[PDB]
Design a protein around this ligand. Structure first.
Ligand SMILES: *[C@@H](CS(C)(=O)=O)[C@H](Cc1ccc(CN)cc1)NC(=O)[C@H](COC)NC(=O)[C@H](CC(C)C)NC(=O)c1cnc(C)s1
Ligand SMILES: [Cl-]
Ligand SMILES: [Mg+2]
Ligand SMILES: [Mg+2]
Ligand SMILES: [Mg+2]
Ligand SMILES: [Mg+2]
Lengths: 244, 224, 240, 243, 219, 241, 204, 196
């Protein structure tokens, strides 16, 4: 029968690792670097696009930074199509919670939910896992600003600063070296871009190869504002920080 | 739940010394309208059983097909289909009885009263009743609907208990049945003159008589 | 009959490659060249009608398909796969969008829905990915004119101009030189016919080329999608 | 290679080896035949007497479908029974809806489509039987033969099993020597002979002859088994012809 | 409602009034009762208005998808079948009473579709509460193979009959003329009643209403 | 090498099971040909009855799908009948749902979309057949549409299918290069059948008797197959000029 | 027993010159018993306003449901929903409960952000659209509002003229209905400012 | 509704009035109640128009698909398909259908299917509301093996009376003749049949 062709995506190796999760992480390691940095007055999301031609229409393009609700955003590393499946599931969960409790979903609850979906693909169903790692940047009135990551295993953790995708080893050292707890958003913006500028496999870091975003409470009357940076704005912040 | 539309009236029957007789008129009434004058309501199964059916005619036609289909199915992988493993009256009845009670229990009855008349392998007379409720009973005389009220009283004067069956000849029994059919024709507003009669005898086998008529009709006292 | 293939036929290999997606992309590479160019006042999509036999009526085989009145699609790769994506794209544009909102979906969302269908063939049980890349050109009121590419993976990217299939590497270089942000639709059609001539071996005329545009409304609106006639192409080939 | 390990897999030839392996099971089975006559069909089968403990005339192989169709097969006997059970369901549903008993060509395709369905998936095995069947319908007599692939055709004569080549040669003589046609009683006699001649391929063990027939004149278009005197008359005719 | 259709020489003329009522109250005096199915087929609607709207839309949507796949214009028989078989399935609970008119490859066709799933194929039909008023006009004056402007007048006259004599019907007269060479969607074709002129101005002057509190938010 | 057993991509971007289903197509060793007249569409196919025990009347690869649509199959008979039964069922369901006879091309596309499913879904194998559909469509006129195991389909002016398809195709190509029209400019179907047979004889280099051919003819509002004697009359007319 | 008139209350909407107005009473009751005088019936999703009269549990449910749907709409479309589009969304949503409907009388009001065109619409409980330019009325005093609106209304009113028209229509209609009143709210909506005013009315 | 099917020497003729009423309103006065399920198998419809139309369309489908596979179906087969639908769905249908068809083997055949879903094969059949008024007339005047002209007159006179007395019946008398020669449609207007 069919058994002959079954890859068996949900098994342990003799060492106690999940083959497909490990290989999906290998996939993700080749994806463009994404960085999240949490400051006292906001979060920064920065991410590097990949391959890019001069002919790619950048202003209408979204491969890295996605919006889940008005308080929570994600940076993607891995299969963009796989991410969009999970993103539309997360967007619904946020609205289901809003409809039920008449309050915005707390960041950790949404993250757990997605991470539980990813986990399910590793334990049952016989399907390949999602080849995606997320950085979740979000705010709620319990814990304030939060950074999380999830990966194909379904494990998630909280961070002050973090990278996913390519050259995470190098990126995480550079962040660990220059991050401080009293840091501010404008400083974190600079750190994020400096880290990508050093870890990039490209010759130089330019506006057309970047997606960029900030979650500030820095708004009038203490309300959270998500800013997905436009191509021209990424170009300005690259000049401001002195990278181009 | 339905309501019967085209209907058949009385089926009457009795045991005699060697076998059973069953009879039923050839009418399919449509309420008060005497709509169909050529409806056969005795349906033989093999050469040892006749199933007489009253009530809804569409449900009768359904039962007719179930029996026809039962004969086919019994013949399958059965080298003794025309001998030791042929269908018995008791098998045919029990099947129908099961069906009738199952259907009433799903609140969707076959809207009929049935009399299965036949002779068994060992020569025994089989005569048993079943209806839309799955109610079953046997008696030396059986009749459905109207015949229960008028035919049974006349037929019971011939065979009043079990011990009268061996004393009753086929001629006496057939006369009684044909007499009862006349009485029903006078008095049942939903009956007809034309009927069918079937004798299932352990010696002479199945004799099926079509296009019989009620005769010797006393009307002369009307003129006064 | 039990559809016993309830497990993925696309899985991660030790290197992190999804084999079947890569192989689907190889099938797209072997397919005939198609391209798209976005102008200021329109978008053009074009491809070669590679006729399997001269007895075949190539007019019956439409490589360029209308998805909505304002959105058109062309492909490179396996034709039968394209055909069933067009069927599903047309339908989803009604069920999940028109019957709800009373209007057709914007280009990006219809693209996203198609991308979703392709992604599901890349992860669902008992299926191979689609062996096509699509180029979807369209217009909507709030986004204006747009051009998207959709790959077997389900990944999609918006383009100013691009090409896929056989001579895509050479065609993309050609387009990079010719494209600017002040092209009119006629200029983009002119460039499309030039770019497409490079990858075509044999006959190069209106009968062997399929070319459509998303442009002005052709007379509630008129449809912006318009497939150019065999005659209309030949006219522009004299000014080539 | 590996193309023969799974059903419904095309080899590089364009063949389904699992089906061709099912044919080997058929070829391994006992000889069964079918003879189309003037107003009907005759079916006969070789039943190998493995032991003296087998009860004579009891282990019946030929099966009736509806009241007018006869089926006989060679190969895996249970597979044949499974196919006839299905055929009976098909013939029953046809009659239920359309009133008339199922026509033989109609019935043939019902078996044909079902056997073919078992070559479409790896989760099922093909049928290990060639089935010879037929009967009399409103358009007259029909004889068919149906292979593990789902292939079937109409036949003047048919044969399958271990003695098929022997039988086929004999059937071909009858077709040549009787262009005007064969009578039902003649076909019974000839069927007996052909099973007796085809028994040389299974000559180690002795056998039991079983014949059935549908004929418009002789059986009123119904399937009946050849029994008693008519069976003995056919056995005598067959025994005379081998000697 | 008063909706009608006629088959004339070159094609189909559909007609409808414009009054939408809740009970005895008029909610819309100028509502569209003539619906688009396909470019060559239209549908006048009576009965329960929601059912009328969403049945025509659903069948219009499915016919659009059908027509994209076949690449040829849809037929009136297929519109008729799709409406019919749906309405029948729902056993009259979808209270859509349609006049379906259009022009095929096979010529002009006109149908009346009822809520229970019966359809009549006819040269002239009327539906709604004003069907008897409208049908009187057709029985009085209809003849087969009329010229266009004549058929337009007959349908308009039949809708008018409904407007005035039926209380459920009112407002303007909409027509839809369908032939092989054109589609004319005339809304409104006629305005048989002028809007009643008011003699006074009853609008209040600023500051007349008593306010408790106010809030202004910009966008 | 399980990428050759089921319908998944090989490293070259190829579906080997689809390609091997195409090879099963010629397993019958039968050549078919289809041409269009003015008022008609004619389909001819070789008929080979190798066994004398076969009833030659039951040996057919032409199918009457609807009254208007005929279908000839190049491939094994079990898959041919699989396809025939489905096409009949689809054509009947179509008429019921949409109230007009299923067009030839719409059926062809429908059967092609079904064929496509077997190339994408792993549990289903492709059918090893090429389906040539013919009709005189009430909108498009004489129509020839062909489907294969890949799920590809296309309309034809004329076509040929089988082991010697290339020879027949080029023979037909050359005739239409001369006449410079998409059809056989002939009033009667009888003469269009005569053309079809004649151009198969020339292309294959073989003479035919009445029992070596099988002919299907589509006219407006019916498709029908010719009897042996109808073909014999056709062969007599060919020989006499 | 009649679900549409257990809780009571009303909504009215009007168009003016480069503006729309939508207004509602504040009552929630259990038939004769007044329960809340802070039950607002007008909600908004971006710049599109939705009044809902009828059974209060359904008013609440639909508000929560359209918030949900318009939120996902905005995330996917990357723009706020327009009145014309939302109207179709309401119609669809209501009709998908055709044979178990929400006992409501919704009213859409807003200005199309691109065209600048003032828009209003109303629906029956199963989603048939009343698409009138002048005014849309709903609730237990709908008849009263129809009469008030037909005599008071005229086209192309300036925002503060329109305020007086809609307010007097609401107030005087509500005072002839036992199940309406207990306060009122009027939104004056312009292309880029919205004025919300609470009205002083008799509290019986 | 007044409908009837009558077998005669050369085959069978179906007959019907043309009136369809909604209460006392004549919704359609030119109704075609003789509907074709196959080339030479037609039916007369009485009862719910929605139901008899729905049934007739399903039968037409079944016989089309039968024909695709097994060639021309018998008139009996058509009646069996009608019956199966009517009987199995008796609780949700109001259909009184007469089925009439011409084989070459069997010649003319008439089957009537009343409300119950029972089948009755008859030399002729009458049905619909107007049939009650002509049981007496039809029984007295019907003969077997009539000529075409005699059977046309028998149906014309019968339905003329059915129309005269039944308010639910009226309009034109349509007929459909089924013989070896083919299918012939006849129509007879009030001015012709009322003066009989
Ligand atoms: C006339 C139909 S009649 C009285 O049967 O002749 C119109 C037809 C019509 C068609 C299309 C449109 C616009 N899409 C509007 C009107 N129908 C109506 O006026 C119907 C009532 O006909 C019986 N009215 C409704 O359906 C109204 C809703 C509109 C006023 C928006 N619904 C109600 O009043 C309801 C009350 N309770 C319900 C449940 S529906
Ligand atoms: Cl399809
Ligand atoms: Mg497969
Ligand atoms: Mg009050
Ligand atoms: Mg009070
Ligand atoms: Mg009358």
């Amino acid at each position: 029968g069919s058994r002959r062709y079954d890859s068996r995506t949900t098994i342990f190796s003799p060492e106690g690792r999940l083959y497909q999760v490990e290989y999906a992480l290998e996939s993700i390691s080749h994806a463009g670097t994404a960085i999240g940095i949490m400051a006292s007055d906001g979060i920064v999301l920065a991410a590097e696009r990949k391959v890019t031609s001069t002919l790619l229409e950048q202003d209408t393009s979204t491969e890295k930074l996605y919006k889940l609700n008005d308080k929570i955003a994600v940076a993607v590393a891995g299969l963009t199509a796989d991410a969009e499946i999970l993103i539309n599931t997360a967007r619904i969960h946020a609205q289901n919670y809003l409809k039920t409790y008449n309050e915005d979903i707390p960041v950790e609850i949404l993250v757990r939910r997605l991470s539980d979906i990813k986990q399910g693909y590793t334990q049952h169903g016989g399907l390949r896992p999602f080849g995606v790692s997320f950085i979740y940047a979000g705010y709620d009135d319990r814990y304030g600003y939060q950074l999380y990551t999830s990966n194909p295993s379904g494990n998630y953790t909280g961070w002050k600063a973090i990278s996913v995708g390519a050259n995470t080893s190098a990126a995480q050292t550079l962040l660990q070296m220059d991050y401080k707890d009293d840091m501010k958003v404008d400083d974190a913006i600079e750190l994020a871009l400096k880290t990508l500028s050093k870890t990039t496999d490209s010759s130089a870091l330019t506006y057309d190869r970047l997606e960029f975003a900030t979650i500030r409470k820095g708004a009038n009357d203490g309300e959270v504002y998500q800013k997905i940076f436009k191509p021209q704005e990424i170009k300005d912040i690259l000049v401001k920080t002195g990278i181009t | 739940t339905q309501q019967p539309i085209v209907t058949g009236t009385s089926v009457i029957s009795m045991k005699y010394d060697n076998g059973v007789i069953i009879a039923a008129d050839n009418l399919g009434s449509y309420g008060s309208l005497l709509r169909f004058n050529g409806v056969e309501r005795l349906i033989p199964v093999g050469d040892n059983t006749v199933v007489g059916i009253s009530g809804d005619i569409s449900d009768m036609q359904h039962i007719e097909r179930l029996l026809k289909d039962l004969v086919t199915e019994n013949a399958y992988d059965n080298p003794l289909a025309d001998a030791e493993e042929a269908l018995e009256p008791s098998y045919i009845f029990e099947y129908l009885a099961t069906v009738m009670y199952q259907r009433r229990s799903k609140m969707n009855p076959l809207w009929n009263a049935i009399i299965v008349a036949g002779v068994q392998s060992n020569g025994d007379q089989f005569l048993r009743y079943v209806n839309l409720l799955g109610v079953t009973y046997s008696s030396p005389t059986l009749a459905t609907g109207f015949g229960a009220h008028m035919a049974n009283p006349l037929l019971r004067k011939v065979v009043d208990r079990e011990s009268d069956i061996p004393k009753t000849t086929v001629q006496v029994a057939e006369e009684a049945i044909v007499n009862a059919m006349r009485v029903l024709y006078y008095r049942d507003a939903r009956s007809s003159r034309n009927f069918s009669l079937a004798i299932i005898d352990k010696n002479t086998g199945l004799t099926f008589k079509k296009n019989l008529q009620v005769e010797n009709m006393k009307w002369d006292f009307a003129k006064d | 009959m039990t559809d016993r293939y309830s497990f993925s036929l696309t899985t991660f290999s030790p290197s992190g490659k999804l084999g079947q997606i890569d192989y689907a992309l190889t099938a797209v590479k072997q397919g005939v060249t198609s391209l798209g160019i976005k102008a200021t006042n329109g978008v053009v999509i074009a491809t070669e009608k590679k006729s399997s036999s001269p007895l075949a009526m190539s007019e019956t085989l439409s490589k360029v398909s209308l998805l909505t009145p304002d959105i058109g699609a062309v492909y490179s790769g396996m034709g039968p796969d394209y055909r069933v994506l067009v069927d599903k794209s047309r339908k989803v544009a009604h069920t999940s969008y028109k019957r709800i909102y009373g209007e057709y979906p914007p280009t990006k969302l219809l693209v996203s829905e198609v991308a979703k269908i392709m992604q599901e063939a890349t992860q669902s049980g008992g299926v191979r990915p689609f062996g096509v890349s699509l180029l979807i050109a369209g217009h909507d009121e709030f986004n204006g004119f747009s051009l998207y590419q959709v790959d077997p993976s389900g990944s999609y990217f918006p383009w100013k101009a691009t090409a896929i299939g056989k001579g895509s590497v050479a065609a993309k270089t050609f387009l990079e030189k010719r494209w600017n942000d002040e092209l009119e639709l006629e200029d983009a059609i002119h460039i499309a016919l030039l770019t497409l001539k490079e990858s075509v071996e044999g006959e190069f005329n209106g009968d062997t080329i399929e070319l459509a545009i998303i442009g002005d409304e052709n007379p509630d609106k008129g449809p912006r999608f318009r497939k150019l006639t065999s005659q209309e192409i030949n006219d522009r080939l004299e000014a080539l | 290679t590996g193309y023969d390990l799974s059903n419904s897999v095309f080899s590089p030839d364009g063949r389904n080896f699992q089906v061709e392996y099912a044919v080997k099971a058929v070829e391994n089975g006992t000889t069964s035949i079918g003879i189309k006559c003037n107003d009907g069909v005759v079916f006969a089968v070789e039943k190998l007497i493995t032991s003296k403990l087998l009860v004579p005339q009891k282990n019946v192989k030929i099966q009736v479908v509806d009241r007018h169709i006869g089926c006989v097969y060679s190969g895996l006997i249970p597979d044949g029974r499974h196919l006839v059970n299905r055929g009976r369901e098909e013939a029953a549903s046809f009659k239920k809806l359309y009133k008339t008993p199922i026509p033989i060509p109609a019935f043939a395709d019902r078996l044909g489509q079902y056997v073919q369905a078992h070559t479409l998936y790896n989760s099922v095995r093909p049928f290990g039987v060639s089935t010879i069947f037929g009967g009399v319908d409103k358009n007259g007599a029909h004889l068919y033969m149906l292979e593990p692939s789902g292939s079937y055709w109409g036949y003047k004569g048919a044969a399958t099993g271990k003695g098929r080549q022997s039988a086929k040669a004999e059937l071909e003589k009858l077709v040549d020597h009787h262009p005007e046609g064969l009578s039902a009683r003649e076909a019974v006699k000839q069927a007996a002979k052909i099973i007796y001649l085809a028994h040389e391929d299974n000559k180690e063990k002795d056998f039991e002859l079983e014949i059935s027939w549908c004929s418009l004149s002789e059986t009123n278009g119904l399937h009946k088994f050849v029994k008693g005197d008519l069976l003995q008359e056919a056995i005598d005719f067959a025994q005379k012809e081998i000697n | 409602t008063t909706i009608a259709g006629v088959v004339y020489k070159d094609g189909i003329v559909l007609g409808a009034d414009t009054r939408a009522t809740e009970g005895m109250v008029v909610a819309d005096k100028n509502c569209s009762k003539i619906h688009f199915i396909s470019p060559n087929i239209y549908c006048c609607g009576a009965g329960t208005a929601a059912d009328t709207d969403m049945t025509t839309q659903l069948i219009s949507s499915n016919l659009e998808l059908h027509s994209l796949s076949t690449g040829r214009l849809p037929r009136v028989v297929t519109a008729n079948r799709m409406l019919k078989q749906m309405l029948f399935r729902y056993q009259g609970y979808i209270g859509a009473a349609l006049v379906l008119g259009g022009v095929d490859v096979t010529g002009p066709h006109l149908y009346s579709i009822y809520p229970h799933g019966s359809t009549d194929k006819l040269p002239y039909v009327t539906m709604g509460s004003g069907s008897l008023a409208a049908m009187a006009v057709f029985e009085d004056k209809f003849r087969p193979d009329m010229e266009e402007e004549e058929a337009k007048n007959l349908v308009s006259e039949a809708i008018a009959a409904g407007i005035f004599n039926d209380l459920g019907s009112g407002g303007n007269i909409d027509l839809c003329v369908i032939s092989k060479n054109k589609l004319d969607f005339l809304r409104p074709y006629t305005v048989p009643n002028k809007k009643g002129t008011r003699l006074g101005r009853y609008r209040c002057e600023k500051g007349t209403t008593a306010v408790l509190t106010e809030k202004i938010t910009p966008l | 090498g399980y990428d050759r057993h089921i319908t998944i991509f090989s490293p070259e971007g190829r579906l080997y099971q689809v390609e091997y289903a195409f090879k099963a197509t010629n397993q019958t060793n039968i050549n078919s040909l289809a041409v269009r007249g003015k008022d008609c569409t004619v389909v001819i196919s070789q008929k080979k009855v190798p066994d004398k025990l076969l009833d030659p009347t039951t040996v057919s690869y032409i199918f009457c799908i609807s009254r208007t649509i005929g279908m000839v199959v190049n491939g094994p008979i079990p898959d041919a009948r699989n396809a025939a039964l489905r096409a009949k069922a689809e054509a009947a369901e179509f008429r019921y749902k949409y109230g007009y006879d299923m067009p030839c091309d719409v059926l062809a596309k429908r059967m092609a979309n079904l064929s496509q499913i077997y190339t994408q879904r792993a549990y289903m194998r492709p059918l090893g057949v090429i389906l040539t559909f013919v009709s005189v469509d009430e909108e498009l006129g004489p129509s020839i549409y062909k489907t294969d195991p890949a799920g590809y389909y296309v309309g034809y002016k004329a076509t040929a299918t089988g082991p010697k398809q290339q020879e027949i195709t080029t023979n037909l190509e050359n005739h239409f290069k001369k006449s410079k029209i998409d059809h056989i400019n002939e009033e009667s179907w009888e003469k269009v059948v005569e053309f079809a047979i004649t151009h198969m004889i020339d292309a294959l280099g073989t003479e035919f008797s009445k029992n070596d051919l099988e002919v299907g003819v589509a006219t407006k509002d019916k498709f029908f197959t010719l009897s042996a004697e109808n073909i014999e009359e056709r062969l007599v007319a060919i020989a006499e000029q | 027993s009649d679900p549409s008139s257990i809780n009571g209350g009303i909504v009215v909407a009007m168009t003016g010159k480069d503006c729309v107005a939508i207004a509602c009473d504040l009552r929630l009751g259990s038939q004769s018993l007044g329960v809340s005088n802070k039950f607002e019936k007008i909600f908004h999703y971006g710049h599109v306003f939705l009044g809902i009269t009828g059974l209060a549990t359904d008013v609440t449910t639909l508000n929560e449901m359209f918030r949900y749907k318009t939120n996902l709409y905005k995330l996917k479309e990357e723009r706020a929903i327009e009145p014309e589009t939302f109207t179709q969304l309401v119609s669809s949503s209501l009709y998908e409960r055709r044979f178990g409907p929400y006992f409501v009388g919704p009213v859409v009001a807003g200005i199309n952000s691109k065209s600048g065109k003032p828009f209003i619409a109303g629906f029956d409980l199963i989603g048939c659209i009343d698409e009138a330019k002048d005014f849309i009325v709903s609730g237990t005093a709908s008849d009263q509002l129809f009469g008030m609106c037909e005599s008071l209304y005229e086209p192309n009113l300036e925002p503060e003229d329109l305020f007086e028209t809609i307010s007097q229509a609401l107030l005087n209609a509500a005072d002839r209905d036992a199940l309406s009143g207990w306060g009122a709210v009027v939104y004056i909506i312009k292309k880029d400012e919205v004025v919300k005013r609470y009205l002083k009315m008799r509290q019986d | 509704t007044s409908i009837m099917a009558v077998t005669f020497k050369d085959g069978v003729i179906l007959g019907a009035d043309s009136r369809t009423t909604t209460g006392a309103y004549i919704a359609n006065r030119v109704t075609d109640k003789l509907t074709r399920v196959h080339d030479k198998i037609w039916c007369c419809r009485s009862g719910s128009a929605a139901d008899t139309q729905a049934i007739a369309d399903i039968v037409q489908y079944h016989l089309e698909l039968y024909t695709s596979q097994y060639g021309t179906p018998s008139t009996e087969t058509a009646a069996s398909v009608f019956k199966e639908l009517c009987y199995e769905n008796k609780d949700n249908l109001t259909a009184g259908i007469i089925v009439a068809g011409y084989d070459d083997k069997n010649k003319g055949e008439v089957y009537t299917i009343p409300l119950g879903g029972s089948v009755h094969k008859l030399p002729y059949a009458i049905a619909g509301s107007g049939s009650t008024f002509i049981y007496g007339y039809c029984d007295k005047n019907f003969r077997e093996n009539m000529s075409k002209e005699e059977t046309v007159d028998f149906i014309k006179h019968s339905l003329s009376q059915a129309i005269k007395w039944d308010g639910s019946s009226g309009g034109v008398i349509r007929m459909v003749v089924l013989t070896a020669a083919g299918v012939e449609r006849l129509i007879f207007y009030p001015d012709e049949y009322e003066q009989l």
